Every structure is written in structure tokens, then in C-alpha cells.
Amino acid sequence: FFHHIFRGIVHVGKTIHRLVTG
Known about the structure:
The PDB classes it as antimicrobial protein. The chain is mainly α.
């Protein structure tokens, strides 16, 4: 399903972008 799959990809996506400049 794809209901609350983008809610957990928030901390993730943010993570990468958090280490992007890393």
C-alpha cells in the first residue's frame, strides 16, 4: 500500500539531505 509510506520517508529523505553535503 501507499498511505503512510511517505510519512516515514520524511526522516529518511531529511537524513540524506542532512548528509548530502557530507
